[PDB]
Amino acid sequence: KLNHAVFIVITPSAIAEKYKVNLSVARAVINHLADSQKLYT
Amino acid sequence: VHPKKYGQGSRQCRVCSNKHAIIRKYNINICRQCFRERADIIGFKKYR
Amino acid sequence: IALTSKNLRAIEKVCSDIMKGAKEKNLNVSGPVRLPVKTLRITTRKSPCGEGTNTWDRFELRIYKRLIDLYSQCEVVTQMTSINIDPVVEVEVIITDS
Amino acid sequence: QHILRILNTNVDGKEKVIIALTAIKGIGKRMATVICKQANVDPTKRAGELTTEEIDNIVHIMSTPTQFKIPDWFLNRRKDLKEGKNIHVIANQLDSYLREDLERMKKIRLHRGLRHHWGLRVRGQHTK
Amino acid sequence: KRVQTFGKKKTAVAVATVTNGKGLIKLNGKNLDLVEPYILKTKVYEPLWLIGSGKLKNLDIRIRVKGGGQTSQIYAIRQAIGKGIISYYQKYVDESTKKELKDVLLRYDRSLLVGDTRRCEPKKFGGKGARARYQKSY
Amino acid sequence: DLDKLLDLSQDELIKLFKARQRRKFQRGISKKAKSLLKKIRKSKKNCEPGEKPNPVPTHLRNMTIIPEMVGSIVATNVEIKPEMIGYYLGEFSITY
Amino acid sequence: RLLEPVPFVKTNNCIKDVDADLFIRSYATHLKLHNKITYPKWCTFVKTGKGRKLAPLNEDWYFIRASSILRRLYLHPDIGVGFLRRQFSSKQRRGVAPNHTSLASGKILRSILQQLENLGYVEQNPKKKGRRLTTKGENAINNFARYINKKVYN
Amino acid sequence: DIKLFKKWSYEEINIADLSLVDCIAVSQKACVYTPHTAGRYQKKRFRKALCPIVERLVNSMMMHGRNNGKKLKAIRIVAYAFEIIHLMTGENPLQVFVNAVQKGGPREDSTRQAVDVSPLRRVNQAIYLICTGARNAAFRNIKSISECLAEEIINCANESSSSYAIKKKDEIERVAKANR
RNA sequence: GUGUCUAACACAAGGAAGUUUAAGGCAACAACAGGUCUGUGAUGUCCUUAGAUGAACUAGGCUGCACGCGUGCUACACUGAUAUAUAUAACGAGUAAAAUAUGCUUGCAUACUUUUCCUCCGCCGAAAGGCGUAGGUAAUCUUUAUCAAUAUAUAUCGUGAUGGGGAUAGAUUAUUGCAAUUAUUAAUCUUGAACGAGGAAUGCCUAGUAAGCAUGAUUCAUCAGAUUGUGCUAACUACGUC
């Protein structure tokens, strides 16, 4: 809903709620950790 | 007279000269009301 | 030699006869190849004025094609086919090697 | 910060650079897409990170797109009969061109004009 | 050299050609790997796992599939694989072993051994479906 | 604008025109329209400022506006405007 | 998934060893690295089908489309322009009417096909009609297939 | 050897109401590597009672407006949901799913009087209840369908008031209690 | 097992199939003042038959729009859209005029050659489409041992009438036709409405069905949101009762 910040476990909805970011930003956060319905398990 | 090498008035039933309802499939020019009379003598059989 | 009819029985009968005829003059034949059936299919509303129920029936005029072919000179096959025929079967001859 | 004012009267920031631009005019997206590529904005990024140069580039393209490599068929608005060139509209120019078209139909007393004057369809109601 | 057997669901038909070989399995122009959905790949690997791959490495398999869509084709392929395994074991191996093998497959399911019996019911006038009607009114 | 439009050739006029108009001129003027146009040309040239051209026995709606047509009353009735180029009559429709 | 414990012997030499998509994306990246082809001009303003109404969104698309064309060429050596149009075909949204099939943009397809012919990896057969790969084209695809096969293996 | 999704053996379950055990597909011939089998269930009354429970669950899940017949995604969603349960709690996801089906099944129903419900009917309603809750949670919401399904299953297994399946099951039973 | 233990039913096993294997075609007796004389050179009577209610030609009209009801389509979104990618099918259907040439002043007069239906292919065209030509009387060539779309995968939205949605409207260049205007039909850009899952009511459906997704044929000079077929994706729920 009001989630929008660029800068201030794995599951993108959970990341997006907890850190107050979009799921698009959450997927970016997952990729940053790592360094469609594709697995992250 | 007006051009009739296209459009509805260019075509009519062979049997009875009807101005509507003509079956032009397989290029025989017969209206369905005529066709049901003659389909057996033309050769057609029914199964469905 | 290609055999066409819209008469099922007549094409079937002629085929057996021409094969029998072929062995009489001892010709080298390939066994009769029945070619895919061609149907003139007409889907017709039963009501003549189109009033009442939407009743449709499907009429079929089914034409039969068959092929039997021969390694022979032209003269024997043409003479044998020409004598043996029945009127509703339409026949065409196809030329072959010596 | 996370926002920017967009020239031609819109305020955006969470929105993607195409999504902000489209939400003005060029909302059929293809016009916006060519403008974004021409401008050199990052199309996957959000509008609150845009520079003044990027905005200025977009306005320059919007005002004159014929100098850029966008095709004549690709541009909105075309001949319109009259000698003074009519290629490309957008915004108040689009409104003005529509008003001029409506006035011209009315002046003619064209069937479509009359129907616009009535406030009703070009094709007819078809019994509703 | 070579033995042939088959599978048939809906329009689809899969003929499987089982040759003496080294453990290659093909589907027309494709390796057996390239099914695409993980679920339907697993279904055709299933009889291979139920026998075990160390009992299949003396034969090469090529399969040719025509007709139907993907789900129908994979069941036709699974039948063709089933019958392929069985025909090799009757023709080269041993008939008593083939009956024993067939029993294990059959207890698991009859579906690979005997294909699907379902076939389309033809459309009739007065509705989109076979039996279904356009809406009645008063 | 208008002076150049009057000057220019038929090939140029079709090229300036929208494709529907261009296709019509390419397909053919025929009898009807040309015959009416010649009568309209003669009537306009030979008249003083005042009363206008008359209808045609075939009551045509099938011809569009061309740059010499202007100020003529068409065949039921409407008068062609200066800026009406390519846009047809719109005439003989009916309302509530 | 990406690495699989298959119950059978794979070929390890040809286009059916490797995943089609992985091959297409990887080969497209190689084509871009190589500098094999360019748009040209008109191809910048495309949409694959008419109803798409956006530019191709994944940015590396032209090389991907070219690479996808090359894979189909290996499969079928009898191809012509109409085959490419049908292959890349999709559904077209008719608005307030149901969808119907519509052929892909033909000029960009023709451009890629002709440009590849000029660069020597495909050859028009006028007798026994259709573009096929050249042996040089086939060898390059096979070499790339072996390289990818080696990469999946190690 | 045989395991669902290549990872869940599923050869052992707990008693529940005992009635459930006959229906559920725990036996080695009814357990499978992946659900899709699509049998013929119209021969007679008890033919459908022999269905694999995971196939029954995906078929139940897939029907809903735009989604109708999208079976492979429904398998992937159930596979993902079981993975979510496996991460969230150390119990086997299948066992938790069995507990959810036990909890989701009401034991009474009614007409204008109250009546008992058969074991087959209880199982069919329970599966339906789990999928309807997941579907209701999913539609017009940020949460994933897999996430909704997994949460509905664990909460129904728990016997939570948050569960749509428990809330519906309680409501059906409450209406039965009201009627008598 | 149950059954006069007959006729036969029920369950299991066998089996490709067990309900008559599944679906059609098929269509008594006797009616209805049901519909059609807007199909007939089937037809009575009555009307009409030369400033014709016949044949034919030119427009306009059948669709206009305060408004009421049928039937479909498209929608109302993240189990989805958007962009790329993988996979794949069955039924089909395919013969009197144009072009080119000559004499005369666009037009008039004459000849002659073939165009004619499906389109491969090759160039040109964003796109529609254009031009050059090939093969086909057809299991052969179009084209169908491969022509489809939902499926499904990776990416992009991150859920907000929103990038869902395409009403409504403007400028185009094309295609068919004598004529396209009351958007014929086509594409390009732009314009970006309602619709937040539907009251009282009511439809269809028991196994490849129901539903979803396509697509051939019919009318056709020109066109599917229609009908009729055909395939694929493949459910639920009783398995009975008045």
PDB file of N, CA, C and O (backbone and C1' of nucleotides) in Angstrom, chain E residues 9-11 30 66-68 71-73 110 121 123-124 126 128 130-132 134-136, chain I residues 16-17 72 87-89 145 203-204 206-212 228-230 232-234:
ATOM      1  N   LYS E   9      -3.694 -42.212 -26.183  1.00  0.00           N
ATOM      2  CA  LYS E   9      -4.670 -41.452 -25.411  1.00  0.00           C
ATOM      3  C   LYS E   9      -5.255 -40.344 -26.276  1.00  0.00           C
ATOM      4  O   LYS E   9      -4.529 -39.540 -26.857  1.00  0.00           O
ATOM      5  N   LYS E  10      -6.607 -40.271 -26.364  1.00  0.00           N
ATOM      6  CA  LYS E  10      -7.331 -39.327 -27.206  1.00  0.00           C
ATOM      7  C   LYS E  10      -6.882 -39.385 -28.663  1.00  0.00           C
ATOM      8  O   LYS E  10      -6.757 -40.467 -29.239  1.00  0.00           O
ATOM      9  N   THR E  11      -6.634 -38.241 -29.323  1.00  0.00           N
ATOM     10  CA  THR E  11      -6.015 -38.247 -30.647  1.00  0.00           C
ATOM     11  C   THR E  11      -4.616 -38.831 -30.629  1.00  0.00           C
ATOM     12  O   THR E  11      -4.232 -39.572 -31.536  1.00  0.00           O
ATOM     13  N   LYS E  30      14.168 -35.119 -30.037  1.00  0.00           N
ATOM     14  CA  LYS E  30      14.476 -34.659 -28.695  1.00  0.00           C
ATOM     15  C   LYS E  30      14.996 -35.773 -27.799  1.00  0.00           C
ATOM     16  O   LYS E  30      14.590 -36.922 -27.906  1.00  0.00           O
ATOM     17  N   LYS E  66       2.605 -38.602 -32.502  1.00  0.00           N
ATOM     18  CA  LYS E  66       1.790 -37.748 -33.349  1.00  0.00           C
ATOM     19  C   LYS E  66       0.416 -37.592 -32.719  1.00  0.00           C
ATOM     20  O   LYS E  66      -0.111 -38.529 -32.112  1.00  0.00           O
ATOM     21  N   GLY E  67      -0.215 -36.409 -32.848  1.00  0.00           N
ATOM     22  CA  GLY E  67      -1.584 -36.210 -32.401  1.00  0.00           C
ATOM     23  C   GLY E  67      -1.681 -35.690 -30.993  1.00  0.00           C
ATOM     24  O   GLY E  67      -0.774 -35.845 -30.178  1.00  0.00           O
ATOM     25  N   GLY E  68      -2.836 -35.079 -30.663  1.00  0.00           N
ATOM     26  CA  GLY E  68      -3.139 -34.559 -29.333  1.00  0.00           C
ATOM     27  C   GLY E  68      -2.276 -33.431 -28.804  1.00  0.00           C
ATOM     28  O   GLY E  68      -1.417 -32.871 -29.487  1.00  0.00           O
ATOM     29  N   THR E  71      -0.485 -33.061 -22.367  1.00  0.00           N
ATOM     30  CA  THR E  71      -0.909 -33.982 -21.316  1.00  0.00           C
ATOM     31  C   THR E  71      -1.330 -35.341 -21.845  1.00  0.00           C
ATOM     32  O   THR E  71      -0.908 -36.391 -21.353  1.00  0.00           O
ATOM     33  N   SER E  72      -2.098 -35.363 -22.946  1.00  0.00           N
ATOM     34  CA  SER E  72      -2.472 -36.573 -23.663  1.00  0.00           C
ATOM     35  C   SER E  72      -1.275 -37.310 -24.243  1.00  0.00           C
ATOM     36  O   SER E  72      -1.146 -38.525 -24.082  1.00  0.00           O
ATOM     37  N   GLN E  73      -0.328 -36.588 -24.872  1.00  0.00           N
ATOM     38  CA  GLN E  73       0.900 -37.145 -25.405  1.00  0.00           C
ATOM     39  C   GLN E  73       1.765 -37.797 -24.337  1.00  0.00           C
ATOM     40  O   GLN E  73       2.236 -38.912 -24.538  1.00  0.00           O
ATOM     41  N   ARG E 110      -2.949 -49.892 -14.227  1.00  0.00           N
ATOM     42  CA  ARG E 110      -3.232 -50.565 -15.486  1.00  0.00           C
ATOM     43  C   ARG E 110      -3.097 -49.590 -16.648  1.00  0.00           C
ATOM     44  O   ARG E 110      -3.088 -49.968 -17.817  1.00  0.00           O
ATOM     45  N   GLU E 121     -17.431 -36.683 -27.310  1.00  0.00           N
ATOM     46  CA  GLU E 121     -18.825 -36.766 -27.684  1.00  0.00           C
ATOM     47  C   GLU E 121     -19.148 -35.597 -28.638  1.00  0.00           C
ATOM     48  O   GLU E 121     -18.829 -34.444 -28.319  1.00  0.00           O
ATOM     49  N   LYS E 123     -20.575 -32.466 -30.999  1.00  0.00           N
ATOM     50  CA  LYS E 123     -21.496 -31.363 -30.809  1.00  0.00           C
ATOM     51  C   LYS E 123     -22.839 -31.580 -31.509  1.00  0.00           C
ATOM     52  O   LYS E 123     -22.923 -32.124 -32.613  1.00  0.00           O
ATOM     53  N   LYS E 124     -23.933 -31.147 -30.864  1.00  0.00           N
ATOM     54  CA  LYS E 124     -25.250 -31.150 -31.448  1.00  0.00           C
ATOM     55  C   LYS E 124     -25.741 -29.722 -31.544  1.00  0.00           C
ATOM     56  O   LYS E 124     -25.308 -28.829 -30.810  1.00  0.00           O
ATOM     57  N   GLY E 126     -28.240 -26.452 -31.040  1.00  0.00           N
ATOM     58  CA  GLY E 126     -28.943 -25.878 -29.897  1.00  0.00           C
ATOM     59  C   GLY E 126     -28.102 -25.678 -28.664  1.00  0.00           C
ATOM     60  O   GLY E 126     -28.613 -25.371 -27.589  1.00  0.00           O
ATOM     61  N   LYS E 128     -23.546 -25.040 -27.267  1.00  0.00           N
ATOM     62  CA  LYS E 128     -22.106 -25.083 -27.457  1.00  0.00           C
ATOM     63  C   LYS E 128     -21.515 -26.468 -27.235  1.00  0.00           C
ATOM     64  O   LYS E 128     -20.666 -26.943 -27.992  1.00  0.00           O
ATOM     65  N   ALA E 130     -21.808 -30.842 -26.243  1.00  0.00           N
ATOM     66  CA  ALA E 130     -22.394 -32.065 -26.739  1.00  0.00           C
ATOM     67  C   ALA E 130     -23.846 -32.279 -26.299  1.00  0.00           C
ATOM     68  O   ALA E 130     -24.723 -32.613 -27.100  1.00  0.00           O
ATOM     69  N   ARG E 131     -24.131 -32.052 -25.007  1.00  0.00           N
ATOM     70  CA  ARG E 131     -25.420 -32.244 -24.384  1.00  0.00           C
ATOM     71  C   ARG E 131     -25.957 -30.897 -23.941  1.00  0.00           C
ATOM     72  O   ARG E 131     -27.153 -30.619 -24.043  1.00  0.00           O
ATOM     73  N   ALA E 132     -25.059 -30.002 -23.494  1.00  0.00           N
ATOM     74  CA  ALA E 132     -25.365 -28.662 -23.059  1.00  0.00           C
ATOM     75  C   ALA E 132     -26.133 -27.841 -24.079  1.00  0.00           C
ATOM     76  O   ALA E 132     -25.996 -28.015 -25.291  1.00  0.00           O
ATOM     77  N   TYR E 134     -27.904 -23.872 -25.277  1.00  0.00           N
ATOM     78  CA  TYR E 134     -28.061 -22.431 -25.127  1.00  0.00           C
ATOM     79  C   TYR E 134     -29.245 -22.099 -24.206  1.00  0.00           C
ATOM     80  O   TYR E 134     -30.188 -22.888 -24.094  1.00  0.00           O
ATOM     81  N   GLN E 135     -29.230 -20.959 -23.479  1.00  0.00           N
ATOM     82  CA  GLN E 135     -30.228 -20.694 -22.449  1.00  0.00           C
ATOM     83  C   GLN E 135     -31.688 -20.656 -22.933  1.00  0.00           C
ATOM     84  O   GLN E 135     -32.046 -19.948 -23.879  1.00  0.00           O
ATOM     85  N   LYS E 136     -32.587 -21.426 -22.277  1.00  0.00           N
ATOM     86  CA  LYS E 136     -34.014 -21.361 -22.550  1.00  0.00           C
ATOM     87  C   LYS E 136     -34.653 -20.123 -21.926  1.00  0.00           C
ATOM     88  O   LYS E 136     -34.128 -19.528 -20.983  1.00  0.00           O
TER      89      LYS E 136
ATOM     90  P     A I  16      -7.405 -56.830 -22.031  1.00  0.00           P
ATOM     91  O5'   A I  16      -7.944 -55.710 -23.017  1.00  0.00           O
ATOM     92  C5'   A I  16      -7.740 -54.299 -22.760  1.00  0.00           C
ATOM     93  C4'   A I  16      -8.836 -53.390 -23.357  1.00  0.00           C
ATOM     94  C3'   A I  16     -10.221 -53.493 -22.709  1.00  0.00           C
ATOM     95  O3'   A I  16     -10.187 -52.771 -21.457  1.00  0.00           O
ATOM     96  C1'   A I  16     -10.436 -53.435 -25.059  1.00  0.00           C
ATOM     97  P     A I  17     -11.212 -53.035 -20.302  1.00  0.00           P
ATOM     98  O5'   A I  17     -12.635 -52.838 -20.957  1.00  0.00           O
ATOM     99  C5'   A I  17     -13.135 -51.483 -21.116  1.00  0.00           C
ATOM    100  C4'   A I  17     -14.417 -51.439 -21.967  1.00  0.00           C
ATOM    101  C3'   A I  17     -15.565 -52.197 -21.301  1.00  0.00           C
ATOM    102  O3'   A I  17     -16.308 -51.299 -20.438  1.00  0.00           O
ATOM    103  C1'   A I  17     -15.294 -52.958 -23.545  1.00  0.00           C
ATOM    104  P     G I  72     -27.451 -17.270 -24.221  1.00  0.00           P
ATOM    105  O5'   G I  72     -26.313 -16.810 -25.231  1.00  0.00           O
ATOM    106  C5'   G I  72     -25.071 -16.199 -24.827  1.00  0.00           C
ATOM    107  C4'   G I  72     -24.412 -15.511 -26.040  1.00  0.00           C
ATOM    108  C3'   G I  72     -23.044 -14.830 -25.808  1.00  0.00           C
ATOM    109  O3'   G I  72     -21.937 -15.747 -26.019  1.00  0.00           O
ATOM    110  C1'   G I  72     -24.542 -13.255 -26.724  1.00  0.00           C
ATOM    111  P     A I  87      10.439 -26.604 -28.558  1.00  0.00           P
ATOM    112  O5'   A I  87       9.337 -27.709 -28.302  1.00  0.00           O
ATOM    113  C5'   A I  87       7.948 -27.310 -28.392  1.00  0.00           C
ATOM    114  C4'   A I  87       7.064 -28.136 -27.449  1.00  0.00           C
ATOM    115  C3'   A I  87       5.834 -28.775 -28.122  1.00  0.00           C
ATOM    116  O3'   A I  87       6.128 -30.088 -28.660  1.00  0.00           O
ATOM    117  C1'   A I  87       5.113 -27.471 -26.316  1.00  0.00           C
ATOM    118  P     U I  88       6.546 -30.153 -30.199  1.00  0.00           P
ATOM    119  O5'   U I  88       5.551 -31.216 -30.848  1.00  0.00           O
ATOM    120  C5'   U I  88       4.375 -30.745 -31.563  1.00  0.00           C
ATOM    121  C4'   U I  88       3.156 -30.563 -30.633  1.00  0.00           C
ATOM    122  C3'   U I  88       1.766 -30.741 -31.276  1.00  0.00           C
ATOM    123  O3'   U I  88       1.506 -32.134 -31.597  1.00  0.00           O
ATOM    124  C1'   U I  88       1.739 -28.988 -29.652  1.00  0.00           C
ATOM    125  P     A I  89       1.204 -32.472 -33.139  1.00  0.00           P
ATOM    126  O5'   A I  89      -0.289 -31.883 -33.367  1.00  0.00           O
ATOM    127  C5'   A I  89      -1.318 -32.832 -32.972  1.00  0.00           C
ATOM    128  C4'   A I  89      -2.792 -32.369 -33.021  1.00  0.00           C
ATOM    129  C3'   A I  89      -3.525 -32.534 -34.353  1.00  0.00           C
ATOM    130  O3'   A I  89      -3.668 -33.932 -34.719  1.00  0.00           O
ATOM    131  C1'   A I  89      -4.285 -30.610 -33.220  1.00  0.00           C
ATOM    132  P     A I 145       0.344 -34.116 -41.747  1.00  0.00           P
ATOM    133  O5'   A I 145       1.753 -33.531 -41.287  1.00  0.00           O
ATOM    134  C5'   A I 145       3.042 -33.939 -41.797  1.00  0.00           C
ATOM    135  C4'   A I 145       3.969 -34.642 -40.777  1.00  0.00           C
ATOM    136  C3'   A I 145       5.356 -35.040 -41.363  1.00  0.00           C
ATOM    137  O3'   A I 145       6.343 -33.978 -41.459  1.00  0.00           O
ATOM    138  C1'   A I 145       4.588 -36.413 -39.574  1.00  0.00           C
ATOM    139  P     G I 203     -34.765 -22.278 -15.163  1.00  0.00           P
ATOM    140  O5'   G I 203     -33.442 -22.155 -16.026  1.00  0.00           O
ATOM    141  C5'   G I 203     -33.530 -21.697 -17.401  1.00  0.00           C
ATOM    142  C4'   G I 203     -32.137 -21.695 -18.044  1.00  0.00           C
ATOM    143  C3'   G I 203     -31.529 -23.095 -18.053  1.00  0.00           C
ATOM    144  O3'   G I 203     -32.137 -23.858 -19.118  1.00  0.00           O
ATOM    145  C1'   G I 203     -29.922 -21.497 -17.365  1.00  0.00           C
ATOM    146  P     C I 204     -32.185 -25.430 -19.017  1.00  0.00           P
ATOM    147  O5'   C I 204     -30.691 -25.887 -19.186  1.00  0.00           O
ATOM    148  C5'   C I 204     -30.011 -25.800 -20.452  1.00  0.00           C
ATOM    149  C4'   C I 204     -28.518 -26.071 -20.250  1.00  0.00           C
ATOM    150  C3'   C I 204     -28.263 -27.421 -19.585  1.00  0.00           C
ATOM    151  O3'   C I 204     -28.404 -28.488 -20.558  1.00  0.00           O
ATOM    152  C1'   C I 204     -26.931 -25.735 -18.573  1.00  0.00           C
ATOM    153  P     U I 206     -25.227 -34.706 -17.806  1.00  0.00           P
ATOM    154  O5'   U I 206     -24.116 -34.836 -16.677  1.00  0.00           O
ATOM    155  C5'   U I 206     -22.729 -35.073 -17.047  1.00  0.00           C
ATOM    156  C4'   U I 206     -22.077 -36.252 -16.296  1.00  0.00           C
ATOM    157  C3'   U I 206     -22.752 -37.616 -16.503  1.00  0.00           C
ATOM    158  O3'   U I 206     -21.782 -38.684 -16.588  1.00  0.00           O
ATOM    159  C1'   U I 206     -22.881 -37.050 -14.227  1.00  0.00           C
ATOM    160  P     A I 207     -21.923 -39.841 -17.656  1.00  0.00           P
ATOM    161  O5'   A I 207     -20.461 -39.939 -18.273  1.00  0.00           O
ATOM    162  C5'   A I 207     -20.084 -39.038 -19.344  1.00  0.00           C
ATOM    163  C4'   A I 207     -18.569 -38.765 -19.416  1.00  0.00           C
ATOM    164  C3'   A I 207     -17.675 -40.012 -19.222  1.00  0.00           C
ATOM    165  O3'   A I 207     -16.540 -40.013 -20.124  1.00  0.00           O
ATOM    166  C1'   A I 207     -17.049 -38.357 -17.715  1.00  0.00           C
ATOM    167  P     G I 208     -16.729 -40.752 -21.519  1.00  0.00           P
ATOM    168  O5'   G I 208     -16.312 -39.654 -22.592  1.00  0.00           O
ATOM    169  C5'   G I 208     -15.019 -39.027 -22.519  1.00  0.00           C
ATOM    170  C4'   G I 208     -15.143 -37.546 -22.154  1.00  0.00           C
ATOM    171  C3'   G I 208     -14.904 -36.627 -23.375  1.00  0.00           C
ATOM    172  O3'   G I 208     -15.579 -35.368 -23.218  1.00  0.00           O
ATOM    173  C1'   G I 208     -13.125 -36.399 -21.870  1.00  0.00           C
ATOM    174  P     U I 209     -16.024 -34.502 -24.471  1.00  0.00           P
ATOM    175  O5'   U I 209     -16.349 -33.064 -23.857  1.00  0.00           O
ATOM    176  C5'   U I 209     -17.719 -32.666 -23.589  1.00  0.00           C
ATOM    177  C4'   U I 209     -18.520 -33.523 -22.569  1.00  0.00           C
ATOM    178  C3'   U I 209     -19.516 -32.766 -21.695  1.00  0.00           C
ATOM    179  O3'   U I 209     -20.783 -32.476 -22.356  1.00  0.00           O
ATOM    180  C1'   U I 209     -18.417 -34.575 -20.495  1.00  0.00           C
ATOM    181  P     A I 210     -21.031 -30.987 -22.854  1.00  0.00           P
ATOM    182  O5'   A I 210     -20.807 -30.079 -21.560  1.00  0.00           O
ATOM    183  C5'   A I 210     -21.653 -30.312 -20.413  1.00  0.00           C
ATOM    184  C4'   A I 210     -21.273 -29.426 -19.211  1.00  0.00           C
ATOM    185  C3'   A I 210     -20.496 -28.099 -19.416  1.00  0.00           C
ATOM    186  O3'   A I 210     -21.361 -27.029 -19.868  1.00  0.00           O
ATOM    187  C1'   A I 210     -19.563 -29.286 -17.618  1.00  0.00           C
ATOM    188  P     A I 211     -20.709 -25.806 -20.663  1.00  0.00           P
ATOM    189  O5'   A I 211     -19.427 -25.354 -19.856  1.00  0.00           O
ATOM    190  C5'   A I 211     -19.505 -24.463 -18.732  1.00  0.00           C
ATOM    191  C4'   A I 211     -18.137 -24.269 -18.057  1.00  0.00           C
ATOM    192  C3'   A I 211     -17.174 -23.589 -19.026  1.00  0.00           C
ATOM    193  O3'   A I 211     -17.413 -22.163 -19.008  1.00  0.00           O
ATOM    194  C1'   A I 211     -16.118 -25.457 -18.038  1.00  0.00           C
ATOM    195  P     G I 212     -17.051 -21.372 -20.335  1.00  0.00           P
ATOM    196  O5'   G I 212     -15.470 -21.478 -20.398  1.00  0.00           O
ATOM    197  C5'   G I 212     -14.684 -20.719 -19.445  1.00  0.00           C
ATOM    198  C4'   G I 212     -13.181 -21.022 -19.561  1.00  0.00           C
ATOM    199  C3'   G I 212     -12.623 -20.758 -20.966  1.00  0.00           C
ATOM    200  O3'   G I 212     -12.329 -19.354 -21.099  1.00  0.00           O
ATOM    201  C1'   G I 212     -11.959 -22.891 -20.280  1.00  0.00           C
ATOM    202  P     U I 228     -25.810 -24.258 -33.422  1.00  0.00           P
ATOM    203  O5'   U I 228     -25.046 -25.142 -34.463  1.00  0.00           O
ATOM    204  C5'   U I 228     -25.712 -25.791 -35.560  1.00  0.00           C
ATOM    205  C4'   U I 228     -24.689 -26.118 -36.649  1.00  0.00           C
ATOM    206  C3'   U I 228     -23.560 -27.082 -36.302  1.00  0.00           C
ATOM    207  O3'   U I 228     -24.080 -28.425 -36.301  1.00  0.00           O
ATOM    208  C1'   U I 228     -22.672 -25.188 -37.428  1.00  0.00           C
ATOM    209  P     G I 229     -23.843 -29.435 -35.121  1.00  0.00           P
ATOM    210  O5'   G I 229     -22.554 -30.187 -35.659  1.00  0.00           O
ATOM    211  C5'   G I 229     -21.253 -29.869 -35.147  1.00  0.00           C
ATOM    212  C4'   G I 229     -20.200 -30.055 -36.232  1.00  0.00           C
ATOM    213  C3'   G I 229     -18.839 -30.541 -35.743  1.00  0.00           C
ATOM    214  O3'   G I 229     -18.852 -31.983 -35.627  1.00  0.00           O
ATOM    215  C1'   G I 229     -18.542 -28.629 -37.051  1.00  0.00           C
ATOM    216  P     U I 230     -18.134 -32.637 -34.385  1.00  0.00           P
ATOM    217  O5'   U I 230     -16.643 -32.124 -34.538  1.00  0.00           O
ATOM    218  C5'   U I 230     -15.844 -32.654 -35.631  1.00  0.00           C
ATOM    219  C4'   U I 230     -14.436 -32.030 -35.697  1.00  0.00           C
ATOM    220  C3'   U I 230     -13.653 -32.142 -34.380  1.00  0.00           C
ATOM    221  O3'   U I 230     -13.055 -33.452 -34.231  1.00  0.00           O
ATOM    222  C1'   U I 230     -13.520 -29.935 -35.178  1.00  0.00           C
ATOM    223  P     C I 232      -8.045 -34.024 -28.910  1.00  0.00           P
ATOM    224  O5'   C I 232      -7.385 -33.005 -27.879  1.00  0.00           O
ATOM    225  C5'   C I 232      -5.989 -32.668 -28.091  1.00  0.00           C
ATOM    226  C4'   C I 232      -5.629 -31.269 -27.579  1.00  0.00           C
ATOM    227  C3'   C I 232      -5.850 -31.090 -26.070  1.00  0.00           C
ATOM    228  O3'   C I 232      -4.746 -31.657 -25.358  1.00  0.00           O
ATOM    229  C1'   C I 232      -6.809 -29.294 -27.192  1.00  0.00           C
ATOM    230  P     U I 233      -4.869 -32.432 -24.011  1.00  0.00           P
ATOM    231  O5'   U I 233      -4.993 -31.269 -22.963  1.00  0.00           O
ATOM    232  C5'   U I 233      -3.922 -30.330 -22.741  1.00  0.00           C
ATOM    233  C4'   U I 233      -4.419 -29.082 -21.985  1.00  0.00           C
ATOM    234  C3'   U I 233      -5.184 -29.318 -20.667  1.00  0.00           C
ATOM    235  O3'   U I 233      -4.296 -29.692 -19.592  1.00  0.00           O
ATOM    236  C1'   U I 233      -6.439 -27.860 -21.920  1.00  0.00           C
ATOM    237  P     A I 234      -4.650 -30.984 -18.713  1.00  0.00           P
ATOM    238  O5'   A I 234      -5.762 -30.535 -17.652  1.00  0.00           O
ATOM    239  C5'   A I 234      -7.016 -29.921 -17.977  1.00  0.00           C
ATOM    240  C4'   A I 234      -8.220 -30.552 -17.247  1.00  0.00           C
ATOM    241  C3'   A I 234      -8.013 -31.995 -16.682  1.00  0.00           C
ATOM    242  O3'   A I 234      -8.873 -32.223 -15.538  1.00  0.00           O
ATOM    243  C1'   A I 234      -9.681 -32.050 -18.239  1.00  0.00           C
TER     244        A I 234
END
